[PDB]
């Protein structure tokens, strides 16, 4: 602030004037226009977009710190979705109204919460979509995802377990008898050292890249580089 | 004033038509709510009073509209105003490459039949009764006010059929005004923007909230009382003819 | 109801402006006829009553409009509505090959200065004046109505300057509405057709009668009372904004 | 250029569609005249050459349009351009108090089916084949040009159904352009005025001269070759989208 | 082809005018870049070759445009096409309540003078020049093509003066076409959207990316070559007259 003040006086010393001749076509209101365009795109997606579900049914498997991490990653994922040329229609399923996760989301979003262009509901993903169209993404599924399908509803578990609990999302998907898929990471990446469960933001970015006709290399460029060593040739 | 006028309001059991009927009957006019038999029109007519009656009709049918007009003439003796506010909306994209989904010709045909064909059916049939009216001091025999949408000029994604029907109404407004000028009937069109009516129930609540926030001023959804006020203003202005009026609060629709 | 409103009507000493002032003062509003000093506006202001005042001003002069608005604020305390009806007409072909005659840049400049530049001058100064109002229930601080012409759409031979100015008004109507929406001011434009005002009775009666006969319905020149009625309707309806309404009787002008 | 392009021209055996097909095929493109079985399009396709094939189809039928598109794909393997020039004209006053004659709902429905429903049928079905195209430099997979009329804007007496259909085309031009923007298909509309096609010569020859004189400049009926030239210009320009171009020679239709 | 044609391109040293000059001279025509003395138009004229000359002139000055046209007539012998591309943009809100800032009258006046008054000055003088040309086989003495903006239809916040000038051009297009029809001069207007010209490429890269994303399809700023292509298409088509063509890629500007 002090540097900007002194430099601002220095820039005042010039007084060169003749700045662009005042030949401007638009006022500098670009952040507002970007927000409005994102809102229009979000409305269009809510009407015709492909559904993508985050199921907030893990509050009992997460400590307070993991809950804060999950909320932060949910914000980053939603933000990445909004900017996209073809956003998903995001559903927040199994989100208890008075639960800890909903409370933290409301606290973090403030009045924007009621204006987020997404569907938040207490009902499960099985009460909203046909069981045949639902694919539940897990890292422990026997099946391996090959192609992104535009008529399928992908379900991501809004779960952050820095205390490893393998099979929890798979177990939940098995109770409902839902098809499960896992991202191809052994096929395309030499995994090196790391954990095979990515964050929500990375997952949504991969899925958005795939939905926009991106290949697996481009889609998996979002996997943290520190984990793997390269894209298998 | 509008005291003693007889208005045939299509789709008058709900939304804009119901608001127009309420305003006109409160001002002292007579109303015939021309609506579908299962639309709850009779209850609205009862609630409005003895100056309003309900005509169960489908604007897509010539016989039903003829029966409704016969009922209107029997009850009140003449038809002076005709407000075409009957219509439906469809949210379907022309083609979706990712989903391989194609717009169904049936949906397009249905929207055209109700919004566009039904409006012209009502107009042509009611012009016959308004032609039997003794011309006014200015030679006016009656007024017809159609309802269009701003989709006729700026339609957003998944609005091809609705936009086609409303654009057809807009395009045919002037020819019909010229056709009926010799017999002193004025034909006008209102192109409302976003109003709070059961039509918007289909959209998610958040979409409606965003769209309302996107109205420059007043930054809200339209109140049907405003549509009724504009309808009465058109009824009371003898020189408004052949024109489309955008009642939209200055909103312009984006893709 | 417009009782209690304060209307600044430019060109209010004659024609459409005088008709608007008469209609509004009759309802109960207060009017400020903003007109040229040597225009007879003093007599009209005296005739209308104690709620009408005369402001001798030129819409193309910033100082004159500032003085007129200062007088309005000193007299009535505030400004609620601003009706721009000041304007001039010129008949001059762009180029006549047989006569070798060219449109003079002076005539084009004068018509632009009066019709277009003066309208914006009044709009900006009265927008500054109306921003001091406390918003009403609906958050509205004032209404600005501007007069355009169907020449903006259907321009005739020897009407290039008039058409340019009216098209400029039509083009600026929506940007200004978007500009003033956050303040709570509505901007509307009326594009009348042919009206029985001194701007037309000056022309030969034969061509004027021919034009009046060519109005589909009513087959007559518009009555300035109809223009005033439409102005009041725009003032009353809170959802009309950023739109042009053709009060022309369904007439489309021929070359 | 248009070398190697494949164009599906509905109503391509006569008039504007035939002129478009002639211009395109004469410049190295391939044409599929999608026309009625008894329209004499087989002779036109034979005369044009091998790059032209004839598909007997009814644009109002899904099965016929699908068969025509399948034939086009089989013969050429692609559909790059679509030109909706199929249409019919009906002249009938909405009401006639002097005669007591009323517009028949059948005429209105037939006009809407052939002009508005058939156009959307072709558009929605050909977006499927143009969606299989691999996007080229710029991401474009095809172009869709529609034939509206100036009657969509200034319709004459006894032209309400035609005006309704053309206004529907004009209204749905933009929503469809917004629908197919992700796919990469441009949707354009041409609103021709008065053209020297078999549609007009049906009128009395005396009226042909009057209509030719009614055009400001050139004072003649439009040549279909000029419609074909505008079609090719729209094809070549990769930035025209969601727009209506009036190819009418400055004419404005009077009542 | 346009070989042998002589084109007077105002604002021809940069942007759309420069692209038009490049295309037309490349096809074999002769061009006169009518531009300001300190716009670096002499370098462009020399770069374009012998068939291009530079006329230092202010479109707002009658004497300067007269001298430019005299130079054009002496150098090439006549004038066939005129392209009005000279213009300036200004962004300024009509009134800012928070800052208490009012739109300056000088900005509005100078935008009007450069765009609307300058276009009319060039139009009238070059129409006088064209009137001397022997009509061709089609009876045409020349073509005039003006550059409007989509701001003439959906101008945004801060575009009041720019929208006023461009709407004036749009409104005066048809009257001038009717005026010059007896002389056989076609008058057309192109309303471009967002083009990659120095008026836009000077913005920060993020703004340019946002603007490109705002275009439905193609999602990029318009190429000036596309504007030149549309200009040539208008020149070659003898039946385009008194029409405004939106070359904007189906975009509709947000508030
Ligand atoms: N809702 C908006 O904001 C909006 C905006 C622009 C235009 N419009 C148009 O306004 C009109 C009023 O709709 P609304 O907003 O009141 O919704 P609405 O559903 O309340 O009005 C439609 C009415 O039409 C009646 N109706 C439907 N089909 C009919 C048929 N075949 N025969 C007879 N009656 C029939 C319905 O029973 C209902 O009363 C519609 O034509 C709509 O397209 C509405
Ligand atoms: N008369 C029509 O049928 C018609 C049609 C379309 C549009 N218009 C427009 O309607 C408006 C009203 O005109 P009218 O028909 O009442 O004719 P009018 O001549 O009676 O109205 C013009 C008024 O503007 C005033 N005026 C002119 N220049 C002024 C200036 N610089 N400063 C202040 N006041 C000034 C005049 O004194 C006069 O009172 C005009 O703007 C006209 O262009 C008229
Ligand atoms: N002729 C004009 O001056 C003019 C002016 C404005 C608009 N238009 C429109 O331009 C288009 C061109 O028509 P035109 O002037 O060449 O007249 P036209 O009769 O020569 O062309 C119409 C064509 O449509 C075909 N057609 C009609 N119904 C069909 C169907 N169901 N399936 C397939 N083909 C069908 C006809 O066989 C014919 O080939 C029409 O849509 C017309 O309404 C024409
Ligand atoms: N750039 C856009 O995206 C865009 C969009 C819509 C409309 N337009 C309009 O298109 C036209 C083309 O301009 P551009 O976009 O190439 O910008 P530009 O500044 O590159 O071109 C304008 C040209 O006009 C010349 N000029 C300016 N004032 C002049 C005067 N008084 N006399 C003579 N020459 C003068 C300038 O020297 C320059 O050569 C302008 O009128 C512009 O407003 C531009
Ligand atoms: N490799 C992978 N394949 C598929 N889904 C994955 C994935 N890595 C992360 N995800 C998704 O990202 C979510 C957060 S990771 C938490 C994983 C935890 N073991 C569980 O039971 O799910 C996962 O629930 C899953 O929906």
Numbering used by the authors:
A (entry chain F): 154 to 386
B (entry chain A), C (entry chain D), D (entry chain B), E (entry chain C): 7 to 261
What does the paper say about this structure?
We determined the structures of these four mt-tRNA maturation complexes using single-particle cryo-EM at a global resolution ranging from 2.7 to 3.2 Å, revealing snapshots of the four tRNA maturation steps, i.e. N1-methylation of purine 9, 5′-leader and 3′-trailer processing and 3′-CCA addition. The architecture of the maturation complexes is globally the same in all structures, i.e. TRMT10C asymmetrically straddles a tetramer of SDR5C1, while wrapping around the pre-tRNA. Our structures show that the TRMT10C/SDR5C1 complex can be a scaffold that presents mitochondrial pre-tRNAs as substrates for chemical modification, i.e. methylation, and nucleolytic cleavages at defined 5′ and 3′ sites and, finally 3′-CCA addition.
The scissile phosphodiester bond between tRNAHis and tRNASer(AGY) is actually positioned in the active site of ELAC2. As a member of the metallo-β-lactamase superfamily, ELAC2 has a highly conserved metal-coordinating signature motif 546HxHxDH551, together with H644, D666, H702 and H724, that coordinates two Zn2+ ions to constitute the catalytic site. The density map suggests the presence of only one of the two Zn2+ ions, which is consistent with the H548A mutation. tRNAHis adopts an L-shaped conformation and its four arms interact with TRMT10C, similarly to the complex with mt-RNase P. The acceptor and T-arms of pre-tRNAHis are involved in extensive contacts with ELAC2, mostly with the Nter β-lactD that offers a shape and charge-complementary surface to bind the pre-tRNA. Deletion of the Nter β-lactD extension abolishes tRNA binding and thus inhibits cleavage activity, showing that this fragment of ELAC2 is a small RNA-binding domain that recognises the T-loop of mt-tRNAs and drives the tRNA-binding of ELAC2. Our structure of ELAC2/mt-pre-tRNAHis(0,Ser) shows in detail this specific situation in which pre-tRNASer(AGY) is released by 3′-end processing of the bordering TRMT10C-bound mt-pre-tRNAHis, providing a structural interpretation of the results from previous studies on the processing of this pair.
